[PDB]
């Protein structure tokens, strides 16, 4: 039951942020004035984990200088924090075979890839996982996904078809899908041979990925032999459900509220405005958590710390945020 392990695997999206990201990693960039590691870390500490494993594929020294100067290498942190040094630019997946060669992980653990920002109570995700355990001895994992039903077409890089069960929400199949800029590529295929004993399924596009996968320790041993996999979902969750290994079913969870993951600036802007607005209750900005800021909250979504010098005859509109010690001037907007 308890003694939750965990592993965060950042540093796979350096293609996305290329004018930046070559002097400090993607995971060390300030989303709202503070570098977004803790937007994962405070979440999965509220999930109640006991160890994490930061894969740092690039700029490994300016990971661990921040980590040792964090609040997590102090002897009351709810998890102990460990890193994994790395040769540069490994594809994902093979980090788990390197883990199995090292052999640390026993039990259920979080496959948090990328850098997430969410409000979901992970506690109620445990009983979905344990109901999967009790009602199936052929399980693989659970995949929590958001319900962004009011917008397709604007979750930029990969649109996906998370086709899954009606009743049990078992993930039936998966397929990558093209972009709205491309009018050309118009087909997907779901071959019905594995569709024999399902009789009820749903195929949706409105589920955004967030790469928060919690599983059992059997599936890295499953992943050990089949050494052909280089992604986490374009190859694996297709190549584990497509009648390849028999008696290994993967499940996927759907929440009802906000749970999102960084893709690019056309997602970074949207999640910055959702977090900086009150669309992310209770994981909000004015609570002054991370590096003991002094944010106050007026109406119209204004965030100001102490020692802010707002000059005369300035106007500050909706949904802004200003750090300490700044100085604006006359006539600014």
């Amino acid at each position: 039951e308890d003694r939750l392990q965990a592993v965060v695997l950042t540093d796979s999206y350096e293609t996305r942020f290329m004018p930046l990201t070559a002097v400090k990693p993607r995971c060390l960039l300030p989303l709202a004035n503070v570098p977004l590691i803790e937007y994962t870390l405070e979440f999965l500490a509220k999930a109640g984990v006991h160890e994490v494993f930061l894969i740092c594929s690039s700029h490994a020294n300016q990971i661990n200088d921040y980590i040792e100067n964090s609040k997590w290498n102090l002897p009351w942190s709810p998890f102990k924090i460990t890193t994994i040094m790395s040769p540069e630019a490994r594809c994902t997946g093979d980090v788990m075979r390197d883990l199995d060669n090292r052999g640390i992980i026993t039990g259920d653990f979080i496959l948090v890839s990328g850098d997430v920002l969410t409000n979901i109570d992970f506690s109620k995700m445990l009983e979905f996982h344990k109901k999967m355990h009790l009602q199936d001895k052929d399980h693989i994992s659970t995949m929590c996904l958001s319900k962004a039903s009011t917008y397709p077409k604007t979750r930029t890089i990969e649109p996906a078809a998370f086709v899954l069960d009606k009743s049990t929400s078992r993930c039936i199949y998966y397929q990558d899908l093209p972009l709205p800029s491309s009018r050309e590529k118009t087909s997907i295929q779901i071959d019905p041979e594995l569709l024999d004993n399902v009789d009820e399924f749903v195929i949706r596009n409105d589920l955004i990925d967030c790469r928060i996968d919690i599983c059992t320790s059997h599936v890295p041993l499953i992943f050990q032999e089949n050494f052909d996999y280089q992604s986490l979902r374009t190859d694996f969750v297709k190549g584990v459900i497509s009648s390849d290994i028999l008696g290994k079913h993967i499940y996927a969870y759907l929440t009802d509220e906000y749970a999102v993951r960084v893709e690019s600036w056309q997602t970074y802007d949207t999640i910055s405005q959702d977090f900086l607005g009150r669309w992310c209750y209770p994981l909000v900005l004015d609570s002054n958590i991370q590096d003991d800021q002094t944010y106050s909250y007026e109406s119209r979504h204004i965030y100001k710390e102490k020692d802010v010098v707002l000059a005369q005859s300035c106007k500050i509109g909706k949904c802004t945020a200003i750090g300490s010690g700044t100085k604006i001037g006359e006539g600014t907007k």
Binding site: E298, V309, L310, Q312, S313
Partner: protein
């Protein structure tokens, strides 16, 4: 050998500094009275200081701040007369207490600001009325805090005091206008907070300062804007009126006599009004922020027997 009555001690050091006000000048004169004239007997000391307070009130009657200072001096010599040192040490003990007001009440005005800066929040248009220098002692530290606000200063007809603020905090660097005193009702719909300063606090919480603070108070109530008053702790006075009319200046507030040839006609109505306890909502002293029923208790406890 001075006699401490009118100007042989009192009015001299009023020309030393135009920053000290009337009641602490009265406190300084009354402590330097018995700091020297202490003829080794507890009887004539109190007779001397009571005679001195009554002749000093007899000097200028229409400056009721003087009555506040000259009566809290009596409260000082009463409580320092208490603890019952058999007068053997109190000839030295009372005078070595002594100058603790001019070391205490002189530096009270920044202690006002240290608790009153956290009232004027960001972008508050402020209405002040009359040259109440404790309000400027708050506003000076407010502008030194680098907080963003705006100020509006009324006229002070006929007592001229409204022209002083616009030549006081303009050169500090605050955007400020000078409204005329009759134009309050057309602007107090827009003014966020309104400050005044008292020349006295009655036994229920009252503003006994100037010509029309009752008018700006009742405008503040029927605009439902908060009506604060910055003062300090040497401004308590026993005088508790019941009307909007205090002790007279020289006659009633409604004259109906005849101008002889060309005498002055502006100052013919009253010049010191009164505000009831309903219109004020919080007052600032050395004793913290202070609701008017708390100032009623504070002036009800140290004046009974």
């Amino acid at each position: 050998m001075s006699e401490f009555n009118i100007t042989e001690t009192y009015l001299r050091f009023l020309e030393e500094d135009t920053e000290m006000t009337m009641p602490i000048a009265a406190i300084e004169a009354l402590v330097t009275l018995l700091r020297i004239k202490t003829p080794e007997t507890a009887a004539e000391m109190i007779n001397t200081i009571k005679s001195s307070t009554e002749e000093l009130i007899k000097s200028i009657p229409n400056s009721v701040s003087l009555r506040a200072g000259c009566d809290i001096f009596m409260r000082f010599v009463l409580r320092n007369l208490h603890l019952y040192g058999d007068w053997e040490n109190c000839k030295q003990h009372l005078i070595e207490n002594g100058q603790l007001f001019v070391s205490r009440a002189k530096k009270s005005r920044n202690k006002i600001a240290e608790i009153g800066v956290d009232f004027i929040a960001d972008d508050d248009i402020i209405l002040v009325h009359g040259y109440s220098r404790a309000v400027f002692s708050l506003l000076n530290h407010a502008a030194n805090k680098f907080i963003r606000f705006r100020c509006v200063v009324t006229e002070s007809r006929p007592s001229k005091q409204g022209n002083q603020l616009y030549t006081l905090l303009e050169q500090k660097g605050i955007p400020v206008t000078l409204i005329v005193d009759s134009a309050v009702g057309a602007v107090i719909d827009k003014v966020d907070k309104v400050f005044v300063g008292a020349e006295g606090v009655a036994e229920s919480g009252g503003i006994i300062n100037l010509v029309g603070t009752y008018s700006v108070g009742v405008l503040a109530h029927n605009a439902r804007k908060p009506f604060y008053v910055v003062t300090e702790s040497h401004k308590f006075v026993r005088m508790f009126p019941l009307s909007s009319d205090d002790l007279p200046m020289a006659g009633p507030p409604l004259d109906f006599t005849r101008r002889t040839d060309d005498l002055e006609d502006a100052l013919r109505g009253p010049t010191i009004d009164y505000t009831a306890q309903e219109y004020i909502t919080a007052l600032i002293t050395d004793l913290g922020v202070l609701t008017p029923s708390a100032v009623s208790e504070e002036l009800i406890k140290m004046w009974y027997d």
